[PDB]
């Protein structure tokens, strides 16, 4: 996370590392929407242009970690998946519209002090919190810079990182990239001269962009880290999958499994 900081232990109980079997490496990040389900960004698993089509027989989900690498003996609750659902109208070829995907954990997680679910937003909660200016929290295990020299100031973070980024006006996002922007993707980041920097980066794709409610005190997840033009780049902003728009889907997916 560019210009972010070390996150307090247990600060993000919904964080879900998305691990890769062989090599044992880090592929993405994601939120735990319920002991059963995991919510991540579609392009994390499917993006042909980069030889990227991951099947359930490759992904491991280490949940509730904090350090990026070191195995946390009785805290992280590793897990394998069962089903992978990506949005049918996933436009990877053009501008990654609906970069959302659901991962069905095989065995419902044993909820605990470090493993705890967020709350998907609903009209009420959404309407009040989704106004430009309002900040948000992006947390992931990504690199600290876009490019660098001889690992200066160390690029890859020791533990989970955090950064509260304010949402920007849509007209500003639209006007900052040649790329097509849809209504299923808001953007957030500081404006030039604003003083504060900070933005997700390679390794945070899937990370939950959450926002705490000032009413019912619940931490909601509003966007999934989706795409971006470089990291921390002045004049550029990060695009987050708009969860709420896709809420209807999330439901459609889960309810079909049974009851």
């Amino acid at each position: 996370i560019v210009e972010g900081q070390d996150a307090e232990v247990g600060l993000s109980p919904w964080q879900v590392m998305l691990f890769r079997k062989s090599p044992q490496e880090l592929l993405c990040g994601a939120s735990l929407i319920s002991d059963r389900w995991v919510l991540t960004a579609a392009h994390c698993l499917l993006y042909p242009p980069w030889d990227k089509n991951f099947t359930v027989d490759d992904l491991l989900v280490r949940i509730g970690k904090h350090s990026r690498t070191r195995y946390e003996r009785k805290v992280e609750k590793i897990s394998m998946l069962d089903k992978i659902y990506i949005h049918p109208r996933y436009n990877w070829k053009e501008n990654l519209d609906r970069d959302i995907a659901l991962l069905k954990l095989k065995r419902p997680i044993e909820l605990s002090d470090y493993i705890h679910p967020v709350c998907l937003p609903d009209k009420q909660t959404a309407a009040k919190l989704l106004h430009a200016g309002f900040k948000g929290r992006v947390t992931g295990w990504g690199n600290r810079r876009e490019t660098w020299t001889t690992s200066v100031a160390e690029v890859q973070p020791s533990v989970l990182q955090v950064v509260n980024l304010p949402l920007v006006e849509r007209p500003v996002c639209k006007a900052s990239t040649r790329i097509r922007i849809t209504d299923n993707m808001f953007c957030a980041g500081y404006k030039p001269g604003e003083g504060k920097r900070g933005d997700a980066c390679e390794g945070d794709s899937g990370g939950p962009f959450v926002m705490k409610s000032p009413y019912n005190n619940r931490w909601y997840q509003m966007g999934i880290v989706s795409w971006g033009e470089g990291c921390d780049r002045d004049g550029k902003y990060g695009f987050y999958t708009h969860v709420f728009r896709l809420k209807k889907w999330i439901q459609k997916v889960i309810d079909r499994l049974g009851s």
Partner: peptide, 28 residues
């Protein structure tokens, strides 16, 4: 609880450093 409530914080009634920022930004 039913969702979005951190044991080690909201439950315990303790706030994390960077939490106050999110609130100040709600000036609207």
């Amino acid at each position: 609880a039913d969702c979005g409530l951190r044991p080690l914080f909201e439950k315990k009634q303790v706030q994390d450093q960077t939490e106050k920022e999110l609130f100040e930004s709600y000036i609207e």
